[PDB]
Write a protein that binds this ligand. Structure first.
Ligand SMILES: [Pb+2]
Ligand SMILES: [Pb+2]
Length: 274
């Protein structure tokens, strides 16, 4: 039933030390997050880049603490034109360029994607549309998936890419506690899984965590608040660090910060040697 993230690996396979630390998190509401000390966590983590999903808070209504963030001061935010969706990206270093959405008006209205370009790569963070209760949004989800894939594909074609976020899909069975009982629930439908795989193959992208821990069970990033889930380790692996194959060599580690509190999701951290 248990999962214990292994120790941070801070050198590349080739022996180069990690130079870049990226942390991703779905915070389930900025203010609620800050409230249940998420900020303090970040402080200890001290990433160079911080990607947040589910801010459910507009840039105009941003909490004060945030701007103060000492080591991460170039901050961008996107949210629907309050209390729903929205994403953010905070960096130690200033990106070459920041953009939003995926270039498709239909999919660009809920503040779900930020694109930040750096020297040696491009970083995309996203909070993916959930299929919903009763798979009522499944069809929309599928359209999204296709449009996203295409977008990413074009991006990668130009610059090596790193994609992170809450992708709202447990890839395979090993990716969740109860595959059987979830095949018809958002996040584990065949449609969704299929989409993910396509993403992988088509971009193409590699699943960082899975790449390093191919046979590791019990490793989740989301547990429903309900019915004591987190406590019983009844979760899903919904958050990823997807990488362009060319970055594999620069890969040091992909972590799952199990114990970090503040949301129904836990953070994930990526170490790259650039
Ligand atoms: Pb949520
Ligand atoms: Pb989610």
């Amino acid at each position: 039933a248990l999962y214990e993230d292994p120790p941070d690996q801070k050198t590349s396979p080739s022996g180069k030390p990690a130079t870049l630390k990226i942390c991703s998190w779905n915070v389930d509401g900025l203010r609620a997050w800050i409230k249940k000390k998420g900020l303090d966590w970040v402080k200890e983590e001290a990433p160079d880049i911080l990607c947040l999903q589910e801010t459910k808070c507009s840039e105009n209504k941003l909490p004060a603490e945030l701007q103060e963030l000492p080591g991460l001061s170039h901050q961008y935010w996107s949210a629907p034109s309050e209390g729903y969706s929205g994403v953010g990206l905070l960096s130690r270093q200033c990106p070459l360029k920041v953009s939003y959405g995926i270039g498709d008006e239909e999919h660009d209205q809920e503040g779900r994607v930020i694109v930040a370009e750096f020297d040696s790569f491009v970083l995309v963070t996203a909070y993916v549309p959930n299929a919903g209760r009763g798979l009522v949004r499944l069809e929309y989800r599928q359209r999204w998936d296709e449009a996203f894939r295409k977008f990413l594909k074009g991006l990668a074609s130009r610059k090596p890419l790193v994609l992170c976020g809450d992708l709202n899909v447990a890839h395979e069975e090993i990716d969740l506690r109860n595959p059987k009982g979830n095949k018809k629930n958002a996040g584990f439908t065949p449609q969704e899984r299929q989409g993910f795989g396509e993403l992988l193959q088509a971009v193409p992208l590699a699943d960082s965590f899975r790449h390093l821990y191919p046979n590791t069970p019990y490793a989740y990033t989301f547990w429903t608040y309900m019915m004591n889930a987190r406590s019983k380790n009844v979760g899903w692996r919904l958050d990823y660090f997807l990488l362009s194959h060319s970055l594999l060599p620069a890969l040091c580690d992909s972590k799952i910060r199990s114990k970090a509190l503040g949301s129904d999701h836990c953070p994930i951290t990526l170490y790259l040697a650039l």
